[PDB]
Amino acid sequence: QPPPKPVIVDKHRPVEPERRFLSPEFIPRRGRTDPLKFQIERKDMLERRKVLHIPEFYVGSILRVTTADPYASGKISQFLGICIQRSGRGLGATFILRNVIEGQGVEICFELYNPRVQEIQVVKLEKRLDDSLLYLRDALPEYSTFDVNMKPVVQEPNQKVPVNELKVKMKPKPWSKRWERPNFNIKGIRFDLCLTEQQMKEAQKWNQPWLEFDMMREYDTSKIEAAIWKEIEASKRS
Amino acid sequence: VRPRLIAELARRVRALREQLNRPRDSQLYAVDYETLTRPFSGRRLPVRAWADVRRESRLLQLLGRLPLFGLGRLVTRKSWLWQHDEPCYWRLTRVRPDYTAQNLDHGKAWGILTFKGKTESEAREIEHVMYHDWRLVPKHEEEAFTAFTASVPYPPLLRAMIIAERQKNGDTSTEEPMLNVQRIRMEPWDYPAKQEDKGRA
Amino acid sequence: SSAYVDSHKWEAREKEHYCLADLASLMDKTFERKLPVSSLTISRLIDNISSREEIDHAEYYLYKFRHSPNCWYLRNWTIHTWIRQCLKYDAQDKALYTLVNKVQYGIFPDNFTFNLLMDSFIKKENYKDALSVVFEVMMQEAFEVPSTQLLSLYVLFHCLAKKTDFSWEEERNFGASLLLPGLKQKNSVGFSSQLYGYALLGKVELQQGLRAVYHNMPLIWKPGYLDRALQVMEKVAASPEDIKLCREALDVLGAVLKALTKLVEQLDIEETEQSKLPQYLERFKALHSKLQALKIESEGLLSLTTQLVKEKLSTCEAEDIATYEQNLQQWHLDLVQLIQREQQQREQA
Amino acid sequence: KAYRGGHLTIRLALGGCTNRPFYRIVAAHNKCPRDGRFVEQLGSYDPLPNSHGEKLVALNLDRIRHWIGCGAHLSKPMEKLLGLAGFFPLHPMMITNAERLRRKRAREVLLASQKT
Ligand SMILES: [Mg+2]
């Protein structure tokens, strides 16, 4: 006997269609330079994208990566980890992964355009309230404790991004970065428990509202991101 | 006196985990017809049943080919009808297959039975359901199938002892002492048994 | 018989109109948390289906229900909702697939519903599908039905239109199916079809032993099928009317070709059937001569006689429809109680 | 020593040095060792003949009846001894052994008559 085939169809109309999404590394930095540089590096990374898939993801997504290392069992290295940040621009763009194994916490900085990486995979796709999750170092190890054998949580092909609205407990105060300050604008931590009303009132000393109220520092992107959409479509269809 | 708690804790946890994720009916009843060894046990089957396991199928596999697993349908104990000519059957009343089974080929089911045409007024349960020794009888050829129709001396030493006893008593009692045997319900081996009494891994 | 086939009550009676996607999501959640579920969900789902891929979703969820903690219920009205939803939207491949692997899906249509199905098969004018389906009805063992006349028509037509010389599986399927329709004790057609089925079963035994006779087929173990055939022919010649067809010639051919030149299930005292073949054939010739001495036209074509059965067929269709409407109205009576039974949970909540 | 389940059983305990067994029919639990503890020393048996040639055995009839009425199963050698005594039915395996020995002896006498 052959096995049946699973089939599921849910057709709520104004949910399925999500429109577009851009990567955080196609956009350039605020600095001044000739857009020719950006165009060239962009067409190079797109000629590479024709090969490599880089499945869409965000910070707080769990990624599994296979890379061709010259020294290893089979010369291949597997690594699974939570994405802490995506840094850099152009070909040098990287993403950080972290994982605690055997009670010890390891972190990798992967270049997503290096050729020695064999392929990327998204075991889980999530978004955290904090855009950068480097406080997981001081957080409890159990938050970053992710197993390697966990299989990909299949996500529907066209849906909104799931945002887990949660908070995290942390190691006692002897930290490295002093996360309680307002310049970080982070919310996953639970300082109501991790520190006192007096210490939070002392930390709000450094509150600088004129940063976000100022209007000459931000960087409008619509123009250049539209141009990037245009060039991506062109190089794709070509 | 010093009490101890972790022992009872482990007892409770083990009982809970056992009742939770014990091996399934079909899982522990499955058999490979080539090697004749049950998985999860690594035990071989008896030589007398090797051929039955190779050729014949199981009770739930017989019952899966008809609606509701055939309530009141004629299923006979093949072993009974090979051990004797008289008809014996199972008035199956309740049925429950195991959902984890792929072909729904395992479960628990029973009802009233009959041995040598002797009915009993109790829906008591089956014996040895999971064997490959089951035969289904159709709805035709049913009535012709279901149709059906002192004492011993004591041992020599014991009777001599009783003779001396009643001689000392003073009564001659010329009759030879005997016991009742029609009362004794000498039952054949194959008369079935209860499942709740026997355990399960 | 378009009135016997179609029925507007079933399609215009007690429609639910719930969201197919919502019911699918609910059933998926319930079967992922692997707790038991009532048949009301599947029933409402099937009643709400109006599409091919929706019927496919129903197939998958019915497989899940078969492999769910509770599947014995298998309500006849639910499976008939499914049957209608399938056959009106014309999924005959799926219908046949489910009906053949009933053990995989467990559909069990009643007499009138199956007669509707086979009448649709007649209207579409297909033969091999109906043949396989009547073999599956032989598996079902449900023949105390007014569809017995339809089964007889089908078998008597297809055994003649077969054109297949040697096939052991199919020949055993025939020799086993030809008995059940004739068991209603009606006429020459009935008991002579019983006789020919006994002959076919004896042939299958002689050619591949008695094992397959009972292993994957519910049959009786008495190897003397030829003895039973001789007994039937003898009592018929002794006794009514005997409108005969020349399948006795096929019986003669089989007997003569078998008379022509490991586990031991046979008993020692009892002789071997190989060694009974000779006296089998001698007594068969004897009964042949006795019958021709005693009805012996041997020209009335058996399938042609089944159109004369169409009159009392149309007669019994009366009480067939009557019982069907009774079943419909009592379904409607006892089913509404289960709707409020589900509302009891929300009331308690 | 409280044993899990088990039951009372009259059986044989062994005494004496090697090549000189001395059996003792005695009531005890099913789980006890061979010469383990017991409840009541019931009777005795010597499988060797005396100077006169007799082989001795002693049985306590009333106490054995009391124990059987209380409930205790029997081991095959001691129930065989009881059957030989006659207080108990004779053993079917003993009947079969006797019949087999007689068949073999008849066969051997037949072989000797054929050879001679
Ligand atoms: Mg530091």
PDB file of N, CA, C and O in Angstrom, chain D residues 36-87:
ATOM      1  N   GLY D  36      17.272 -24.841  52.627  1.00  0.00           N
ATOM      2  CA  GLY D  36      16.953 -23.646  53.371  1.00  0.00           C
ATOM      3  C   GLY D  36      16.068 -23.945  54.568  1.00  0.00           C
ATOM      4  O   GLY D  36      15.874 -25.088  54.984  1.00  0.00           O
ATOM      5  N   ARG D  37      15.518 -22.872  55.131  1.00  0.00           N
ATOM      6  CA  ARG D  37      14.640 -23.010  56.278  1.00  0.00           C
ATOM      7  C   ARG D  37      13.377 -23.772  55.888  1.00  0.00           C
ATOM      8  O   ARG D  37      13.069 -23.967  54.708  1.00  0.00           O
ATOM      9  N   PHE D  38      12.637 -24.203  56.904  1.00  0.00           N
ATOM     10  CA  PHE D  38      11.410 -24.954  56.701  1.00  0.00           C
ATOM     11  C   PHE D  38      10.437 -24.589  57.812  1.00  0.00           C
ATOM     12  O   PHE D  38      10.711 -23.717  58.643  1.00  0.00           O
ATOM     13  N   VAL D  39       9.294 -25.264  57.825  1.00  0.00           N
ATOM     14  CA  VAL D  39       8.252 -25.038  58.816  1.00  0.00           C
ATOM     15  C   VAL D  39       8.118 -26.229  59.757  1.00  0.00           C
ATOM     16  O   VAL D  39       8.139 -26.071  60.979  1.00  0.00           O
ATOM     17  N   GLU D  40       7.976 -27.431  59.204  1.00  0.00           N
ATOM     18  CA  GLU D  40       7.822 -28.639  60.006  1.00  0.00           C
ATOM     19  C   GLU D  40       8.491 -29.782  59.260  1.00  0.00           C
ATOM     20  O   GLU D  40       8.155 -30.045  58.102  1.00  0.00           O
ATOM     21  N   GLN D  41       9.425 -30.465  59.919  1.00  0.00           N
ATOM     22  CA  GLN D  41      10.091 -31.622  59.329  1.00  0.00           C
ATOM     23  C   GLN D  41       9.117 -32.794  59.308  1.00  0.00           C
ATOM     24  O   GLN D  41       8.795 -33.366  60.355  1.00  0.00           O
ATOM     25  N   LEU D  42       8.658 -33.160  58.111  1.00  0.00           N
ATOM     26  CA  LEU D  42       7.547 -34.095  57.953  1.00  0.00           C
ATOM     27  C   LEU D  42       7.995 -35.555  57.932  1.00  0.00           C
ATOM     28  O   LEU D  42       7.563 -36.348  58.775  1.00  0.00           O
ATOM     29  N   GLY D  43       8.853 -35.930  56.985  1.00  0.00           N
ATOM     30  CA  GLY D  43       9.284 -37.309  56.889  1.00  0.00           C
ATOM     31  C   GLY D  43      10.637 -37.429  56.226  1.00  0.00           C
ATOM     32  O   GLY D  43      11.234 -36.438  55.803  1.00  0.00           O
ATOM     33  N   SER D  44      11.091 -38.671  56.079  1.00  0.00           N
ATOM     34  CA  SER D  44      12.444 -38.927  55.597  1.00  0.00           C
ATOM     35  C   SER D  44      12.458 -40.113  54.643  1.00  0.00           C
ATOM     36  O   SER D  44      11.489 -40.864  54.535  1.00  0.00           O
ATOM     37  N   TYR D  45      13.586 -40.271  53.951  1.00  0.00           N
ATOM     38  CA  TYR D  45      13.771 -41.323  52.962  1.00  0.00           C
ATOM     39  C   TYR D  45      15.263 -41.574  52.785  1.00  0.00           C
ATOM     40  O   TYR D  45      16.056 -40.626  52.776  1.00  0.00           O
ATOM     41  N   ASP D  46      15.637 -42.842  52.633  1.00  0.00           N
ATOM     42  CA  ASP D  46      17.025 -43.191  52.317  1.00  0.00           C
ATOM     43  C   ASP D  46      17.063 -44.002  51.028  1.00  0.00           C
ATOM     44  O   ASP D  46      16.547 -45.135  50.997  1.00  0.00           O
ATOM     45  N   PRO D  47      17.647 -43.486  49.941  1.00  0.00           N
ATOM     46  CA  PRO D  47      17.640 -44.235  48.677  1.00  0.00           C
ATOM     47  C   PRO D  47      18.565 -45.439  48.661  1.00  0.00           C
ATOM     48  O   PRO D  47      18.613 -46.142  47.644  1.00  0.00           O
ATOM     49  N   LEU D  48      19.302 -45.704  49.744  1.00  0.00           N
ATOM     50  CA  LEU D  48      20.177 -46.862  49.791  1.00  0.00           C
ATOM     51  C   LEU D  48      19.575 -47.953  50.670  1.00  0.00           C
ATOM     52  O   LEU D  48      18.853 -47.658  51.628  1.00  0.00           O
ATOM     53  N   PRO D  49      19.849 -49.219  50.375  1.00  0.00           N
ATOM     54  CA  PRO D  49      19.300 -50.303  51.191  1.00  0.00           C
ATOM     55  C   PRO D  49      20.084 -50.498  52.481  1.00  0.00           C
ATOM     56  O   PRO D  49      21.259 -50.149  52.592  1.00  0.00           O
ATOM     57  N   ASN D  50      19.398 -51.072  53.466  1.00  0.00           N
ATOM     58  CA  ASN D  50      19.995 -51.327  54.769  1.00  0.00           C
ATOM     59  C   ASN D  50      20.778 -52.638  54.720  1.00  0.00           C
ATOM     60  O   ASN D  50      20.975 -53.237  53.660  1.00  0.00           O
ATOM     61  N   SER D  51      21.236 -53.102  55.886  1.00  0.00           N
ATOM     62  CA  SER D  51      21.923 -54.387  55.942  1.00  0.00           C
ATOM     63  C   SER D  51      20.993 -55.523  55.545  1.00  0.00           C
ATOM     64  O   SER D  51      21.438 -56.515  54.955  1.00  0.00           O
ATOM     65  N   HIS D  52      19.703 -55.397  55.858  1.00  0.00           N
ATOM     66  CA  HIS D  52      18.724 -56.392  55.447  1.00  0.00           C
ATOM     67  C   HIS D  52      18.358 -56.264  53.976  1.00  0.00           C
ATOM     68  O   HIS D  52      17.888 -57.239  53.380  1.00  0.00           O
ATOM     69  N   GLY D  53      18.559 -55.087  53.384  1.00  0.00           N
ATOM     70  CA  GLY D  53      18.240 -54.827  51.998  1.00  0.00           C
ATOM     71  C   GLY D  53      17.114 -53.837  51.806  1.00  0.00           C
ATOM     72  O   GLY D  53      16.964 -53.291  50.705  1.00  0.00           O
ATOM     73  N   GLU D  54      16.319 -53.591  52.844  1.00  0.00           N
ATOM     74  CA  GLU D  54      15.217 -52.647  52.743  1.00  0.00           C
ATOM     75  C   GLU D  54      15.732 -51.222  52.584  1.00  0.00           C
ATOM     76  O   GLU D  54      16.813 -50.868  53.062  1.00  0.00           O
ATOM     77  N   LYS D  55      14.935 -50.402  51.907  1.00  0.00           N
ATOM     78  CA  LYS D  55      15.163 -48.966  51.809  1.00  0.00           C
ATOM     79  C   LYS D  55      14.089 -48.265  52.627  1.00  0.00           C
ATOM     80  O   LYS D  55      12.894 -48.483  52.402  1.00  0.00           O
ATOM     81  N   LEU D  56      14.513 -47.429  53.567  1.00  0.00           N
ATOM     82  CA  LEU D  56      13.605 -46.906  54.573  1.00  0.00           C
ATOM     83  C   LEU D  56      12.981 -45.585  54.141  1.00  0.00           C
ATOM     84  O   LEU D  56      13.543 -44.813  53.355  1.00  0.00           O
ATOM     85  N   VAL D  57      11.807 -45.321  54.704  1.00  0.00           N
ATOM     86  CA  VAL D  57      11.090 -44.081  54.457  1.00  0.00           C
ATOM     87  C   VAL D  57      10.037 -43.932  55.542  1.00  0.00           C
ATOM     88  O   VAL D  57       9.421 -44.911  55.972  1.00  0.00           O
ATOM     89  N   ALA D  58       9.836 -42.695  55.980  1.00  0.00           N
ATOM     90  CA  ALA D  58       8.877 -42.366  57.019  1.00  0.00           C
ATOM     91  C   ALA D  58       8.020 -41.208  56.540  1.00  0.00           C
ATOM     92  O   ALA D  58       8.547 -40.205  56.043  1.00  0.00           O
ATOM     93  N   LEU D  59       6.705 -41.346  56.724  1.00  0.00           N
ATOM     94  CA  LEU D  59       5.716 -40.346  56.344  1.00  0.00           C
ATOM     95  C   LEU D  59       4.836 -40.019  57.542  1.00  0.00           C
ATOM     96  O   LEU D  59       4.484 -40.909  58.323  1.00  0.00           O
ATOM     97  N   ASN D  60       4.479 -38.746  57.677  1.00  0.00           N
ATOM     98  CA  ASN D  60       3.617 -38.264  58.758  1.00  0.00           C
ATOM     99  C   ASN D  60       2.245 -37.962  58.156  1.00  0.00           C
ATOM    100  O   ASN D  60       1.998 -36.867  57.645  1.00  0.00           O
ATOM    101  N   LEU D  61       1.348 -38.944  58.242  1.00  0.00           N
ATOM    102  CA  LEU D  61       0.114 -38.903  57.461  1.00  0.00           C
ATOM    103  C   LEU D  61      -0.805 -37.775  57.919  1.00  0.00           C
ATOM    104  O   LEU D  61      -1.292 -36.989  57.098  1.00  0.00           O
ATOM    105  N   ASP D  62      -1.072 -37.692  59.224  1.00  0.00           N
ATOM    106  CA  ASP D  62      -2.013 -36.690  59.714  1.00  0.00           C
ATOM    107  C   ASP D  62      -1.511 -35.280  59.434  1.00  0.00           C
ATOM    108  O   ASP D  62      -2.276 -34.414  58.994  1.00  0.00           O
ATOM    109  N   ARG D  63      -0.223 -35.032  59.678  1.00  0.00           N
ATOM    110  CA  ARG D  63       0.320 -33.700  59.447  1.00  0.00           C
ATOM    111  C   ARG D  63       0.341 -33.364  57.963  1.00  0.00           C
ATOM    112  O   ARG D  63       0.070 -32.221  57.578  1.00  0.00           O
ATOM    113  N   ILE D  64       0.654 -34.341  57.112  1.00  0.00           N
ATOM    114  CA  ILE D  64       0.646 -34.080  55.678  1.00  0.00           C
ATOM    115  C   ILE D  64      -0.767 -33.758  55.211  1.00  0.00           C
ATOM    116  O   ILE D  64      -0.974 -32.870  54.375  1.00  0.00           O
ATOM    117  N   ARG D  65      -1.765 -34.460  55.753  1.00  0.00           N
ATOM    118  CA  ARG D  65      -3.149 -34.152  55.407  1.00  0.00           C
ATOM    119  C   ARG D  65      -3.529 -32.755  55.880  1.00  0.00           C
ATOM    120  O   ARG D  65      -4.208 -32.010  55.163  1.00  0.00           O
ATOM    121  N   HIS D  66      -3.097 -32.383  57.085  1.00  0.00           N
ATOM    122  CA  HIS D  66      -3.345 -31.031  57.575  1.00  0.00           C
ATOM    123  C   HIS D  66      -2.735 -29.991  56.646  1.00  0.00           C
ATOM    124  O   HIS D  66      -3.370 -28.978  56.328  1.00  0.00           O
ATOM    125  N   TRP D  67      -1.503 -30.226  56.195  1.00  0.00           N
ATOM    126  CA  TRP D  67      -0.840 -29.250  55.337  1.00  0.00           C
ATOM    127  C   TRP D  67      -1.512 -29.168  53.973  1.00  0.00           C
ATOM    128  O   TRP D  67      -1.622 -28.081  53.394  1.00  0.00           O
ATOM    129  N   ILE D  68      -1.969 -30.301  53.440  1.00  0.00           N
ATOM    130  CA  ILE D  68      -2.668 -30.275  52.159  1.00  0.00           C
ATOM    131  C   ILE D  68      -4.003 -29.556  52.298  1.00  0.00           C
ATOM    132  O   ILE D  68      -4.436 -28.843  51.385  1.00  0.00           O
ATOM    133  N   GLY D  69      -4.676 -29.725  53.439  1.00  0.00           N
ATOM    134  CA  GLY D  69      -5.909 -28.995  53.667  1.00  0.00           C
ATOM    135  C   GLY D  69      -5.683 -27.509  53.850  1.00  0.00           C
ATOM    136  O   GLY D  69      -6.540 -26.696  53.491  1.00  0.00           O
ATOM    137  N   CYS D  70      -4.535 -27.133  54.416  1.00  0.00           N
ATOM    138  CA  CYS D  70      -4.182 -25.720  54.490  1.00  0.00           C
ATOM    139  C   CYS D  70      -3.821 -25.164  53.119  1.00  0.00           C
ATOM    140  O   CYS D  70      -4.046 -23.978  52.853  1.00  0.00           O
ATOM    141  N   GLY D  71      -3.266 -26.000  52.243  1.00  0.00           N
ATOM    142  CA  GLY D  71      -2.922 -25.582  50.898  1.00  0.00           C
ATOM    143  C   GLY D  71      -1.431 -25.568  50.640  1.00  0.00           C
ATOM    144  O   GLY D  71      -0.724 -24.658  51.085  1.00  0.00           O
ATOM    145  N   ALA D  72      -0.940 -26.576  49.921  1.00  0.00           N
ATOM    146  CA  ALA D  72       0.473 -26.653  49.576  1.00  0.00           C
ATOM    147  C   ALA D  72       0.634 -27.573  48.377  1.00  0.00           C
ATOM    148  O   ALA D  72       0.087 -28.679  48.366  1.00  0.00           O
ATOM    149  N   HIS D  73       1.379 -27.115  47.375  1.00  0.00           N
ATOM    150  CA  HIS D  73       1.603 -27.905  46.177  1.00  0.00           C
ATOM    151  C   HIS D  73       2.713 -28.928  46.408  1.00  0.00           C
ATOM    152  O   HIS D  73       3.479 -28.849  47.371  1.00  0.00           O
ATOM    153  N   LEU D  74       2.786 -29.902  45.503  1.00  0.00           N
ATOM    154  CA  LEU D  74       3.670 -31.050  45.638  1.00  0.00           C
ATOM    155  C   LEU D  74       4.700 -31.057  44.518  1.00  0.00           C
ATOM    156  O   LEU D  74       4.395 -30.694  43.378  1.00  0.00           O
ATOM    157  N   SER D  75       5.919 -31.471  44.849  1.00  0.00           N
ATOM    158  CA  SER D  75       6.957 -31.677  43.851  1.00  0.00           C
ATOM    159  C   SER D  75       6.868 -33.094  43.292  1.00  0.00           C
ATOM    160  O   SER D  75       6.345 -34.014  43.931  1.00  0.00           O
ATOM    161  N   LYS D  76       7.383 -33.258  42.074  1.00  0.00           N
ATOM    162  CA  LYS D  76       7.180 -34.517  41.367  1.00  0.00           C
ATOM    163  C   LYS D  76       7.837 -35.705  42.064  1.00  0.00           C
ATOM    164  O   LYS D  76       7.191 -36.765  42.141  1.00  0.00           O
ATOM    165  N   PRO D  77       9.051 -35.612  42.618  1.00  0.00           N
ATOM    166  CA  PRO D  77       9.620 -36.815  43.246  1.00  0.00           C
ATOM    167  C   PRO D  77       8.895 -37.212  44.516  1.00  0.00           C
ATOM    168  O   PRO D  77       8.692 -38.408  44.762  1.00  0.00           O
ATOM    169  N   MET D  78       8.481 -36.243  45.335  1.00  0.00           N
ATOM    170  CA  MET D  78       7.812 -36.589  46.584  1.00  0.00           C
ATOM    171  C   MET D  78       6.406 -37.111  46.321  1.00  0.00           C
ATOM    172  O   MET D  78       5.954 -38.049  46.986  1.00  0.00           O
ATOM    173  N   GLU D  79       5.702 -36.537  45.342  1.00  0.00           N
ATOM    174  CA  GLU D  79       4.400 -37.097  44.996  1.00  0.00           C
ATOM    175  C   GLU D  79       4.542 -38.465  44.337  1.00  0.00           C
ATOM    176  O   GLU D  79       3.664 -39.319  44.494  1.00  0.00           O
ATOM    177  N   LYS D  80       5.654 -38.709  43.639  1.00  0.00           N
ATOM    178  CA  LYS D  80       5.927 -40.052  43.139  1.00  0.00           C
ATOM    179  C   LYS D  80       6.146 -41.029  44.286  1.00  0.00           C
ATOM    180  O   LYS D  80       5.659 -42.165  44.249  1.00  0.00           O
ATOM    181  N   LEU D  81       6.892 -40.605  45.307  1.00  0.00           N
ATOM    182  CA  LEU D  81       7.076 -41.442  46.488  1.00  0.00           C
ATOM    183  C   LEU D  81       5.742 -41.733  47.160  1.00  0.00           C
ATOM    184  O   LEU D  81       5.494 -42.855  47.614  1.00  0.00           O
ATOM    185  N   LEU D  82       4.864 -40.730  47.230  1.00  0.00           N
ATOM    186  CA  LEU D  82       3.548 -40.945  47.822  1.00  0.00           C
ATOM    187  C   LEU D  82       2.738 -41.943  47.003  1.00  0.00           C
ATOM    188  O   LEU D  82       2.070 -42.826  47.559  1.00  0.00           O
ATOM    189  N   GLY D  83       2.785 -41.818  45.675  1.00  0.00           N
ATOM    190  CA  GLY D  83       2.098 -42.780  44.832  1.00  0.00           C
ATOM    191  C   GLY D  83       2.622 -44.190  45.022  1.00  0.00           C
ATOM    192  O   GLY D  83       1.850 -45.151  45.068  1.00  0.00           O
ATOM    193  N   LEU D  84       3.943 -44.333  45.140  1.00  0.00           N
ATOM    194  CA  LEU D  84       4.517 -45.638  45.452  1.00  0.00           C
ATOM    195  C   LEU D  84       4.022 -46.141  46.800  1.00  0.00           C
ATOM    196  O   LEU D  84       3.772 -47.339  46.974  1.00  0.00           O
ATOM    197  N   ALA D  85       3.874 -45.236  47.770  1.00  0.00           N
ATOM    198  CA  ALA D  85       3.342 -45.629  49.070  1.00  0.00           C
ATOM    199  C   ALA D  85       1.936 -46.190  48.931  1.00  0.00           C
ATOM    200  O   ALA D  85       1.591 -47.194  49.564  1.00  0.00           O
ATOM    201  N   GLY D  86       1.110 -45.552  48.104  1.00  0.00           N
ATOM    202  CA  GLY D  86      -0.262 -45.959  47.891  1.00  0.00           C
ATOM    203  C   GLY D  86      -1.283 -45.041  48.524  1.00  0.00           C
ATOM    204  O   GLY D  86      -2.456 -45.078  48.133  1.00  0.00           O
ATOM    205  N   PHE D  87      -0.872 -44.222  49.492  1.00  0.00           N
ATOM    206  CA  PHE D  87      -1.748 -43.174  50.000  1.00  0.00           C
ATOM    207  C   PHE D  87      -2.145 -42.190  48.909  1.00  0.00           C
ATOM    208  O   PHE D  87      -3.144 -41.479  49.062  1.00  0.00           O
TER     209      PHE D  87
END
